Amino acid sequence: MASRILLNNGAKMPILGLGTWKSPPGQVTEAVKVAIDVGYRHIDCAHVYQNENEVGVAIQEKLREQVVKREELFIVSKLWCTYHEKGLVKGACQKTLSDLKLDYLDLYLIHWPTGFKPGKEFFPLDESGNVVPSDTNILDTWAAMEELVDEGLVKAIGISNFNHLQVEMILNKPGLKYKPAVNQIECHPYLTQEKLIQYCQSKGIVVTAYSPLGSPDRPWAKPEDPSLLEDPRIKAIAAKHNKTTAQVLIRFPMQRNLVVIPKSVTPERIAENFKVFDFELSSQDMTTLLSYNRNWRVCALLSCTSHKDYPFHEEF
Ligand SMILES: NC(=O)c1ccc[n+]([C@@H]2O[C@H](COP(=O)([O-])OP(=O)(O)OC[C@H]3O[C@@H](n4cnc5c(N)ncnc54)[C@H](OP(=O)(O)O)[C@@H]3O)[C@@H](O)[C@H]2O)c1
Ligand SMILES: O=C(O)COc1cc(Cl)ccc1C(=O)NCc1ccc(I)cc1
């Protein structure tokens, strides 16, 4: 299987990338350096992760060392919810570029479909704990994203955590100039996303699977939640293939024509997670993994559920 997938902007995107949410700032520079040394060419970033400066130090050092050329890297970041306004989008993108020490992003995503009140706080709340919305809509935010392409700041634009109706809304936007290249969504054997993936793929939108290992380090994990990495059924498939459970969990979305972005700051795991291009899951393995769906989400947040554009009320 090829290492890159063709996007609807004509560029190629590496199907395996390194995730950086929760990567501590004192560890992420080495994580990214190691990743690039062992073959990663795609890094998934976001302003809200609060570590773009440190990710950027690694990228810049590897470019300066001539380990890789800029054209060989595929750097992704995301517009946070408090920057959905027309007059804030460019500055948000530019802050990310400055922190990452780049002159362009390969892909810039609307991080969530919901706009929040601008200000210092990433999750502005009212006194009862509800997020404070902005009156921005996804269509006007999309137009602002299109301007970034036309100004040379980003090569591609896309969306993240958009449900099927929201993807459709973008595709049906009056005067749409650029289709979204990517929809980045949670996807793993407990949340298999067959409906949304089929819709996006049918429209030429590439899907990126986040939390492919079930995000065991998510800060709201409870001791009782289901655990992909410990699931004996998945362990059995891994054992049959002489691979680790994580390697199976990474190969799974690859064979569905998805991009996948496992996170690690452990050098041995960063390397392990990349060694997924030399084995194949059978069709029966794939269907078996799909069968584990339980509609379980890592990524959801009660405080945001009443926002008009909160994505997880719809079935898909
Ligand atoms: N667009 C969005 O809204 C959104 C939401 C969530 C995530 N994402 C992106 O997707 C990335 C991945 O998702 P995620 O960070 O939620 O979780 P994940 O990649 O599913 O899991 C990361 C966890 O798995 C551990 N791990 C990694 N490789 C392992 C291996 N080979 N064996 C055992 N454990 C392993 C990591 O530990 P160590 O790091 O300690 O090694 C870490 O605790 C994020 O970092 C972010 O870039 C985007
Ligand atoms: O959004 C991500 O990429 C990962 O999740 C996070 C990352 C940070 Cl750095 C802070 C908070 C979250 C989080 O709470 N995510 C769940 C979440 C769900 C719906 C909405 I609208 C907003 C957030």
Residue 10: give its domain's CATH number: 3.20.20.100
Beta-bridge mates of residue 159? 110, 183
Atom of ligand 1 nearest to the CA of 45: 47
In terms of Cα–Cα distance, which of 105, 77, 263 is closest to 184?
77
Resolution given for this structure, in angstroms: 0.9
Maximum Cα interatomic distance, the chain, rounded to a whole number of Å:
54
CA of 299 to the centre of ligand 2 (A): 7
Atom of ligand 1 nearest to the CA of 185: 1
The whole-angstrom separation of Cα 182 and Cα 199 is 12
Cα 200-302-289 angle, rounded to 5 deg: 45
Q: Domains in the chain: how many in total?
A: 1
CA of 40 to the centre of ligand 2 (A): 25
220 marked ligand binding residue: yes
Residue range(s) defining the domain that contains residue 180: 1-316
Contact 138, 145 (CB under 8 A): no
Tokens standing for residue 232: 């004996």
CB of 262 shorter than 6 A to ligand 1: yes
165 marked ligand binding residue: no
Query: 105: helix, coil or strand?
Result: strand
Query: What determination technique applies here?
Result: X-ray
Cα 146-151-156 angle, rounded to 5 deg: 50
Cβ neighbours of residue 186 closer than 8 Å, sequence gap 6 or more = 161, 193, 209, 210, 211, 297, 298, 299
Cβ neighbours of residue 10 closer than 8 Å, sequence gap 6 or more = none
Measured by CA distance, the residue closest to atom 18 of ligand 2 is 300
